């Protein structure tokens, strides 16, 4: 079970794809909903994602159908298409997924944020870093729902530097565009969702606090945070969850005026990566780093909740720390950081001590030495 949000509000969820193309935006929306009795949200909603995850894992394609069998009807505790809780302007998070992931696999974060009063737009990237994603070739193919699928691209050694940077830059562009889409929708611009779902986008009109916008992301998505911040000042601060820094150009490190928070796992990190994080530091600017004790790279994604303790630890989905404790610490720290840097007038400043790594399960800065 993926944990419910700890905040006061019920949480809803839907999908938005506009335009229908592989250049258009595709996102999963988590939002404060009314109290309601809708069904929960299907966690991995097409067979093709499982096939893609298998390709990502490098396994026999029978593992695809195995994963599909084990996980294909599993849900996450967000109510599908429930109405938006009206009468408040909500701050907005744009969330970026890791390599091998897709939009739906960070609902633990999405839900908990939403339950504390954020609208979260989890983008699905079309840079071929997702295990799978899809789009429509033409208007008629959108109408009848005939999907065209894009699977993860595997690279040669000589392409890595070059293509990863393109991808992270395409990712940045996708975050920016999804932001403009939501802002258009907030102003009331009619938008035909290419997915034909029972959710009225006009509910979102005048519901976004237009100035209070952050970008958050895991792994490749942590790099995406930083490229995005450097490229788009509409984002006021960023939180990078166990960022893989490799995709970034050398130019970006000094070009991040916004507040930036690094939340790391214990066992993923390494000098080359931490050195790059440290290149983002400047005295005139705002930076914080913490490290969750006994955590793994997968602690930030939803698969850390998909299996038992023993199998999870075997597969490096879980660390020595409890996955609920892990994710609670990451989310609460995130909430305090957002409150400070978006100027929110909520109670999240109760977790200011987490930002500074003041918890028995946190390490201030890093455990990695770089000398
Ligand atoms: C240089 C590549 C072959 C290395 O590919 C990685 C990709 C990725 O997404 N993440 C999170 C990583 O940690 N690595 C090492
Ligand atoms: Ca720009
Ligand atoms: Cl790890
Ligand atoms: Cl290293």
From Swiss-Prot:
Induction: Up-regulated upon monocyte differentiation toward macrophage lineage. Changing residue 219 to A: Loss of activity. Changing residue 314 to K: Impairs the association with HDL particles. It is found in: Secreted, Extracellular space. It comes from the Eukaryota. One of its GO terms (cellular component) is low-density lipoprotein particle. Changing residue 232 to N: Diminishes activity. Disulfide bonds: none annotated. The active site is at residues 219, 242, 297. It is an enzyme of class 3 (hydrolase). GO terms for biological process: lipid oxidation; low-density lipoprotein particle remodeling; peptide hormone processing; phosphatidylcholine catabolic process; plasma lipoprotein particle oxidation; platelet activating factor catabolic process; platelet activating factor metabolic process; positive regulation of inflammatory response. GO terms for molecular function: 1-alkyl-2-acetylglycerophosphocholine esterase activity; calcium-independent phospholipase A2 activity; hydrolase activity, acting on ester bonds; phospholipid binding. The keyword Secreted applies. It catalyses: a 1-O-alkyl-2-acetyl-sn-glycero-3-phosphocholine + H2O = a 1-O-alkyl-sn-glycero-3-phosphocholine + acetate + H(+); 1-O-decyl-2-acetyl-sn-glycero-3-phosphocholine + H2O = 1-O-decyl-sn-glycero-3-phosphocholine + acetate + H(+); 1-O-dodecyl-2-acetyl-sn-glycero-3-phosphocholine + H2O = 1-O-dodecyl-sn-glycero-3-phosphocholine + acetate + H(+); 1-O-tetradecyl-2-acetyl-sn-glycero-3-phosphocholine + H2O = 1-O-tetradecyl-sn-glycero-3-phosphocholine + acetate + H(+). Belongs to the AB hydrolase superfamily. Lipase family. This is Platelet-activating factor acetylhydrolase. The chain holds residues 55 to 425 of 441 of the full protein.
């Amino acid at each position: 079970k993926i944990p419910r949000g700890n905040g006061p509000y019920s949480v809803g969820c839907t999908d938005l794809m506009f335009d229908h193309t592989n250049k258009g935006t595709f996102l999963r929306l988590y939002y404060p909903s009314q109290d309601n009795d809708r069904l929960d949200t299907l966690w991995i909603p097409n067979k093709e994602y499982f096939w893609g995850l298998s390709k990502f894992l490098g396994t026999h394609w029978l593992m695809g159908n195995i994963l599909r069998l084990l996980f294909g009807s599993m849900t996450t505790p967000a109510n599908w298409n429930s109405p938006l809780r009206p009468g408040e302007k909500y701050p907005l998070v744009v969330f970026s997924h890791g390599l091998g992931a897709f939009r739906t696999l960070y609902s633990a974060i999405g839900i908990d944020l939403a339950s504390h009063g954020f609208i979260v737009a989890a983008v699905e990237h079309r840079d071929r870093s997702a295990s799978a994603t899809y789009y429509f070739k033409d208007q008629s193919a959108a109408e009848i729902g005939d999907k065209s699928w894009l699977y993860l691209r595997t690279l040669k050694q000589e392409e890595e530097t070059h293509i990863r940077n393109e991808q992270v830059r395409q990712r940045a562009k996708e975050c920016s565009q999804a932001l403009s889409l939501i802002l258009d929708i907030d102003h009331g611009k009619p938008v035909k969702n290419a997915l034909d779902l029972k959710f009225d986008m006009e509910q979102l009109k005048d519901s976004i606090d237009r100035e209070k916008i952050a970008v958050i992301g895991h792994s490749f998505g942590g790099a995406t945070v930083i490229q995005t911040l450097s490229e788009d000042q509409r984002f006021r601060c960023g939180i990078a969850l166990d960022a893989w820094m490799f995709p970034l150009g050398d130019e970006v490190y000094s070009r991040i005026p916004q507040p930036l928070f690094f939340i790391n796992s214990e066992y993923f990190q390494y000098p080359a990566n931490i050195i790059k994080m440290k290149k983002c530091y400047s005295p005139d600017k705002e930076r914080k780093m913490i490290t969750i004790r006994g955590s793994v790279h997968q602690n930030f994604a939803d698969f850390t909740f998909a299996t038992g303790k023993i199998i999870g630890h075997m597969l490096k989905l879980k660390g020595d720390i409890d996955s609920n404790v892990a994710i609670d610490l990451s989310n609460k720290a995130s909430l305090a950081f957002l409150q400070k840097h978006l100027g929110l007038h909520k109670d999240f400043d109760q977790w200011d001590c987490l930002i500074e790594g003041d918890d028995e399960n946190l390490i201030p800065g890093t455990n990695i030495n770089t000398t």
